[PDB]
């Protein structure tokens, strides 16, 4: 219903350059009916707004948070999305049999939400736990995914929750054309976002696992800008002729 469908990573992407956050932000802001904007983060959508009271972030049209597990606008969450990732997952019986490990404890309720179930390796434990954790939800037939990172944090996810299936389905819903989206990030954990149907840009100040996926999967909707953070969505929305 719009001209742009402006799709963003937040920390280290939209945030990071403060002076070329408000530079976008200015000029984003007085061509705001033009555009869907959606931030896209692994952070939880509290988290997020705690990130846009100390930055100052506009407001979004959406926030795909949470490992993609959590579609917010407005007026509440996205309840086609939520129905989505709901299908065959059994929130229960898999923290039920999470719980049972010793070694795992369960993060803060803020870090919990119905598609969710996340948990504290002890320190003192031996990864192996995880993959003991693995195997067994992989002898059932519940589609869960475990996320294992930093060597402590561990996430029980539908396997179809992620960044990149959040806006890939935010994309369709919207109706928004693959040359009317722009994806933007800097993380390996943003591959799923360019593997969307949609032109993109790569901030210069990406990591070593985005750049090696561009040097061998990008084409010419994935544009390698010169600028880093918001200075490269701001590039890259004249490079593409965005709101012109
Ligand atoms: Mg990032």
Not at 28 to 33: A, E, F, H, I, V
Not at 88 to 100: E, F, N, S, T, V
Not at 156 to 167: D, F, H, I, V, W
Not at 205 to 228: F, I, T
Request: charged share 20%.
């Amino acid at each position: 219903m719009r001209q742009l469908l402006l799709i963003s990573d937040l920390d280290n992407t939209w945030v990071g350059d403060q002076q070329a956050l408000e530079h976008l932000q200015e000029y984003l802001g007085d061509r705001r009916g033009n555009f869907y904007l959606a931030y896209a983060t692994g952070r939880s959508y509290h988290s997020a707004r705690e990130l846009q009271k100390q930055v100052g972030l506009m407001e979004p049209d959406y926030w795909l948070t949470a490992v993609g597990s959590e579609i917010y606008h407005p007026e509440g969450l996205d309840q086609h999305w939520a129905d989505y990732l709901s299908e065959h997952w059994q929130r229960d019986i898999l923290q039920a049999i999470a719980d049972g490990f010793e070694a795992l404890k369960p993060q803060s309720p803020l870090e919990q939400n119905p598609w969710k179930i996340s948990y504290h390796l002890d320190p003192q434990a031996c990864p192996t736990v995880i993959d003991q954790l693995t195997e067994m939800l992989k002898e059932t037939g519940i589609p869960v995914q475990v996320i294992f990172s930093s060597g402590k944090d561990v996430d029980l996810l539908p396997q179809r929750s992620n960044k990149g299936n959040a806006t890939q389905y935010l994309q369709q819903h919207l109706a928004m054309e693959p040359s009317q989206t722009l994806v933007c990030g800097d993380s390996g954990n943003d591959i799923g976002l360019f593997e969307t149907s949609a032109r993109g840009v790569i901030v210069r100040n990406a990591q070593p696992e985005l750049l090696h996926w561009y040097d061998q999967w990008g084409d010419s909707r994935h544009y390698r800008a010169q600028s880093s953070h918001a200075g490269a969505i701001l590039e890259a929305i004249a490079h593409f002729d965005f709101l012109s």
